[PDB]
Amino acid sequence: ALDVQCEQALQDWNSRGDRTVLVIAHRLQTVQRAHQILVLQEGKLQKL
């Protein structure tokens, strides 16, 4: 529930090199800039 401008602003500055971050997204939206991607379906993890 965030407008596009704020979504872009809060894209990847969360991490500071000493913070672990887990970004849960319904789709692959503004998450391709993440070091690791984990796809989950019906409670099972799918390898890339």
């Binding site: 529930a1 965030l2 407008d3 401008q5 704020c6």
Partner: protein
């Protein structure tokens, strides 16, 4: 029919009536058509729905 008409509608919440959330909204919803209402947060869209 389902034909809605906003005519210069303005609104301020009763708890804070000095601030106007909506100013001079004029538009019309006609049956068989879709009217998207887009904008940033706090613009007043949910206020229009209410």
């Amino acid at each position: 029919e389902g034909l809605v008409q906003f005519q210069d509608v303005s609104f301020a919440y009763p708890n804070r009536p000095d601030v106007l959330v909506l100013q001079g909204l004029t538009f019309t919803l006609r049956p068989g058509e879709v009217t998207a209402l887009v904008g940033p947060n706090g613009s007043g869209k949910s206020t229009v729905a209410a």
